[PDB]
Design a protein around this ligand. Sequence first.
Ligand SMILES: Nc1nc(N)nc(OCCOc2ccccc2)n1
Ligand SMILES: [Cl-]
Length: 446
Amino acid sequence: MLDKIVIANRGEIALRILRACKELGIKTVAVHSSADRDLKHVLLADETVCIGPAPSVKSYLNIPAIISAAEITGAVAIHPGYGFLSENANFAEQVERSGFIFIGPKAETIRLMGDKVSAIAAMKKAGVPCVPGSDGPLGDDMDKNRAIAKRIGYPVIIKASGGGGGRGMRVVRGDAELAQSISMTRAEAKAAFSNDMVYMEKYLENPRHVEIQVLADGQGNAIYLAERDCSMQRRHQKVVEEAPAPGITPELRRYIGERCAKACVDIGYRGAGTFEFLFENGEFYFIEMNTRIQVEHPVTEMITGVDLIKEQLRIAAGQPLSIKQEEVHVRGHAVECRINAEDPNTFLPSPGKITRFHAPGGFGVRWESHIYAGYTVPPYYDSMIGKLICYGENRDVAIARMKNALQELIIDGIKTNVDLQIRIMNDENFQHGGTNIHYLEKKLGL
Ligand SMILES: Nc1nc(N)nc(OCCOc2ccccc2)n1
Ligand SMILES: [Cl-]
């Protein structure tokens, strides 16, 4: 087991990781910005290092300062969490070059999955079903580009290869808009990613977001831990996630899951990972892979009993997966509501001092948050301040428990989305299940 690790993150995920470390006897180093001295996990850590001022560029994205902190403390590994540097291949490369363990895949694998064109080619080769598309980058030849779009069939979507998660894309519904659409996506991708490579896919009209959780160790074991539905979104940002995905049969789960595990083996994947699919008319289509642990990992933990952060740590230390595929069983149902410090009308971040705080409790209730009474939410970081996860023997119980837990949650002094979450839980279509990726924005517009 790893003696000591730097937690290269903040907020709820840093606390999530700290608890896993404590359970395993692993010493913790909390690197933090000067605005995050009073973070819960910082106050609980074995050692703390202030790595820079509030702005992320000089703290949580500051590669030299993070690696220096690992060096000075005698840490052996760095857990990147999600966001920040977690999908940064050069960071992972530098960490390993510096002689520390990066809690994640090899830098090569991060790089492969961050290049959406090469990722898709690897998945298609591995037997993972993908979206009909260009199978390659689009060039400047607009006659060729029109031919590709005709072959695929309109509507199509142009996507940046260095992009992802709704960033760097636009829908094309006919020839007339194709040239300008490619040109604009390209320009935006050059500006944002210093990588102007774009590709084409069939635009799916009403899909669900269904993603598969995997774990792969360094002993060659790779398993899938069912799926999550993350269709409830606003501006491509997940709002609600659940596990398992409604309407997914054990046969479908097994079908897609086995293909994801096989793909892990083929590419030499290591650690936690997530295969993102669009699901429509009973079919999966791979869009992208995330190499990090994700925000919504707790719903998977609730229905499988597998602690995914502890698995990440075990994997990094050279231990094999603690469970076999035949030992992984979907039991019950879990829903996660993200709690955001945001204005209800503008949807803009609403930072400030929490004056009164109360967490919900009870059977099946899991509150993932660093917030406490008197804690100030800084303006410099993401608006997500907590995660409410509720588990039940079935979906109706999980949702019932979520409604009750949301009503117990008190966060005064700042504006939050608790009222919105309650509205979603009470939404008749959500209660039926299987709403698509456009539902929430449609509901909010009505
Ligand atoms: N609908 C859809 N089709 C394809 N081929 N790819 C993706 O990627 C996810 C990007 O998300 C959206 C969501 C709504 C509108 C446009 C893109 N979506
Ligand atoms: Cl994430």
